[PDB]
Enzyme design. Structure first.
Site, mmCIF file in Angstrom:
data_model
loop_
_atom_site.group_PDB
_atom_site.id
_atom_site.type_symbol
_atom_site.label_atom_id
_atom_site.label_comp_id
_atom_site.label_asym_id
_atom_site.label_seq_id
_atom_site.Cartn_x
_atom_site.Cartn_y
_atom_site.Cartn_z
ATOM 1 N N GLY B 7 -13.333 -2.669 61.152
ATOM 2 C CA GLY B 7 -12.334 -1.642 60.930
ATOM 3 C C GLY B 7 -12.239 -1.173 59.501
ATOM 4 O O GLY B 7 -12.699 -1.836 58.584
ATOM 5 N N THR B 8 -11.623 -0.014 59.333
ATOM 6 C CA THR B 8 -11.479 0.629 58.039
ATOM 7 C C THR B 8 -10.528 -0.125 57.103
ATOM 8 O O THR B 8 -9.905 -1.116 57.499
ATOM 9 C CB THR B 8 -11.045 2.130 58.219
ATOM 10 O OG1 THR B 8 -11.189 2.809 56.975
ATOM 11 C CG2 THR B 8 -9.599 2.248 58.692
ATOM 12 N N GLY B 10 -7.323 -1.144 55.422
ATOM 13 C CA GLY B 10 -5.925 -1.113 55.833
ATOM 14 C C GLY B 10 -5.738 -1.252 57.334
ATOM 15 O O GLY B 10 -4.616 -1.125 57.826
ATOM 16 N N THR B 15 -5.628 -10.080 58.018
ATOM 17 C CA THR B 15 -4.459 -10.578 58.752
ATOM 18 C C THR B 15 -4.842 -11.067 60.156
ATOM 19 O O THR B 15 -4.518 -12.191 60.541
ATOM 20 C CB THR B 15 -3.362 -9.486 58.828
ATOM 21 O OG1 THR B 15 -3.028 -9.070 57.498
ATOM 22 C CG2 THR B 15 -2.092 -9.991 59.561
ATOM 23 N N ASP B 71 -14.825 -11.417 58.794
ATOM 24 C CA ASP B 71 -13.834 -10.472 58.299
ATOM 25 C C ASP B 71 -14.590 -9.309 57.648
ATOM 26 O O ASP B 71 -14.902 -9.345 56.455
ATOM 27 C CB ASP B 71 -12.894 -11.192 57.318
ATOM 28 C CG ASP B 71 -11.827 -10.289 56.729
ATOM 29 O OD1 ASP B 71 -11.817 -9.084 57.020
ATOM 30 O OD2 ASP B 71 -10.991 -10.799 55.956
HETATM 31 N N1 LIG Z 1 -19.445 -1.737 51.837
HETATM 32 C C1 LIG Z 1 -18.197 -1.754 51.312
HETATM 33 C C2 LIG Z 1 -17.273 -2.745 51.658
HETATM 34 C C3 LIG Z 1 -16.004 -2.714 51.087
HETATM 35 N N2 LIG Z 1 -15.683 -1.732 50.219
HETATM 36 C C4 LIG Z 1 -14.370 -1.668 49.555
HETATM 37 C C5 LIG Z 1 -13.233 -1.061 50.373
HETATM 38 C C6 LIG Z 1 -12.036 -1.952 50.078
HETATM 39 O O1 LIG Z 1 -11.180 -1.391 49.070
HETATM 40 C C7 LIG Z 1 -12.632 -3.226 49.503
HETATM 41 C C8 LIG Z 1 -12.599 -4.321 50.536
HETATM 42 O O2 LIG Z 1 -11.380 -5.033 50.441
HETATM 43 P P1 LIG Z 1 -11.088 -6.070 51.618
HETATM 44 O O3 LIG Z 1 -12.252 -7.027 51.727
HETATM 45 O O4 LIG Z 1 -9.677 -6.590 51.448
HETATM 46 O O5 LIG Z 1 -11.210 -5.163 52.941
HETATM 47 P P2 LIG Z 1 -10.045 -4.290 53.606
HETATM 48 O O6 LIG Z 1 -9.108 -3.870 52.502
HETATM 49 O O7 LIG Z 1 -10.848 -3.276 54.382
HETATM 50 O O8 LIG Z 1 -9.308 -5.343 54.626
HETATM 51 P P3 LIG Z 1 -8.054 -5.076 55.634
HETATM 52 O O9 LIG Z 1 -8.606 -4.526 56.922
HETATM 53 O O10 LIG Z 1 -7.435 -6.424 55.793
HETATM 54 O O11 LIG Z 1 -7.200 -4.079 54.886
HETATM 55 O O12 LIG Z 1 -14.002 -2.993 49.169
HETATM 56 C C9 LIG Z 1 -16.634 -0.750 49.882
HETATM 57 O O13 LIG Z 1 -16.347 0.167 49.077
HETATM 58 N N3 LIG Z 1 -17.857 -0.786 50.440
#
Ligand SMILES: Nc1ccn([C@H]2C[C@H](O)[C@@H](COP(=O)(O)OP(=O)(O)OP(=O)(O)O)O2)c(=O)n1
Ligand SMILES: Nc1ccn([C@H]2C[C@H](O)[C@@H](COP(=O)(O)OP(=O)(O)OP(=O)(O)O)O2)c(=O)n1
Lengths: 187, 189
Positions: B7-8, B10, B15, B71
């Site tokens: 998932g994207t 946020g 969690t 994750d």
């Molecule tokens: N190939 C990728 C993977 C991740 N990111 C960035 C996007 C997010 O700002 C950060 C990843 O932070 P987290 O691992 O906390 O991922 P999320 O914020 O997506 O997790 P959640 O779904 O819990 O919000 O790195 C990116 O630019 N490119």
């Protein structure tokens, strides 16, 4: 027989490869500079281009990996990143990235012989000038001298770990080739 | 059981991972943002940082690869490169480099998951979760970035729906409900 041809820019790797190919009939593993989408702009600004170029180099060399003469090897690519880090064209973080990335993503790779075409920087430069690649004409001697020193140091650090055979690349090509064939036939 | 949480930004992946870990006792495969040497400067200038960041992402994820909850997965990283190419933060050449590099270096060097849990979420909710969390770095770029990424997540899903065991979870629902639906699904397989 897997034959690695190892040496700095202007060492004469592609000339030597061709001459060995003629005598043994082997395929040459080349990475053509004309097919490199980064080459045209690479030397104009190293700070901007190096990282992108060096990842491209790793990719290209890996696809070629999937009786051979290797015109430069994958062992040599990190030498170019090290030189740009030494000359502050790459920072610590980007260097760590590539280095870790080189061992944990990129990194069989076995060679029967690694032919080190050891050459003075002076001769290497005049071979570069003769060839006349506009792109290579742009950077100064300090770059070439740093690279050569880095090639020699790689060799000294890895001498026991690969079947190196050192060839004096100041000698003329007929002599180099004669010494190379004599060595190949003895093994 | 290999559980992928997909998932994207946020969506609530970390969690949800934690909640599943609590119930099954599984290890969570995380890539900590605090250990990312590029993160601090990433969002300040995407044009400058994206390529370096995205290669770093591939490396880090590969080393973790050498009963698990993932994750975010390695399948998702190219989504972020695609988004930056769509938004002209990366040119054609650099995109080709990475893309070829992704298949001929990273992918080539399993990657099998029993379930890929797609926490589908509206961009609005995703943004407000981003604001709540309060990562200074993420606060900097605008909505267009988030909306582009979400659209790209949905499109990846639609293009790959038949090729992975996706299970879609409405991430607007509250966490207790999400988790209940997830456990019900896990137990049925
Ligand atoms: N190939 C990728 C993977 C991740 N990111 C960035 C996007 C997010 O700002 C950060 C990843 O932070 P987290 O691992 O906390 O991922 P999320 O914020 O997506 O997790 P959640 O779904 O819990 O919000 O790195 C990116 O630019 N490119
Ligand atoms: N990891 C690498 C590998 C190569 N190059 C650059 C240096 C050269 O300018 C060009 C490679 O040119 P060639 O493959 O034609 O070989 P050389 O120029 O080294 O000369 P020779 O092969 O005749 O010794 O790409 C680089 O920057 N980084």
């Amino acid at each position: 027989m897997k034959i690695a041809i190892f040496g700095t820019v202007g060492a004469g790797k592609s000339t030597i490869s061709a001459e060995i190919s003629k005598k043994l009939g082997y395929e040459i593993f080349k990475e053509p500079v004309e097919e490199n989408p980064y080459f045209e702009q690479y030397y104009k600004d190293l700070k901007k281009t190096v990282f992108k170029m060096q990842i491209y180099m790793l990719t290209a060399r890996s696809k070629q990996l999937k009786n051979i003469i290797f015109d430069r090897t994958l062992l040599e690519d990190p030498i170019f990143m090290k030189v740009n880090y030494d000359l502050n064209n790459v920072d610590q973080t980007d260097y760590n990235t590539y280095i870790d990335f080189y061992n944990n993503v990129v990194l069989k790779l076995s060679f029967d012989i690694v032919i080190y075409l050891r050459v003075s920087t002076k001769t290497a430069i005049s071979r570069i000038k003769k060839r006349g690649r506009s792109e290579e004409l742009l950077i100064g001697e300090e770059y070439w001298e740093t690279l050569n020193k880095n090639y020699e140091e790689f060799y000294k650090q890895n001498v026991y770990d690969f079947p190196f055979f050192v060839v004096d690349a100041e000698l003329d090509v007929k002599t180099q080739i004669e010494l190379i064939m004599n060595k190949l036939n003895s093994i």
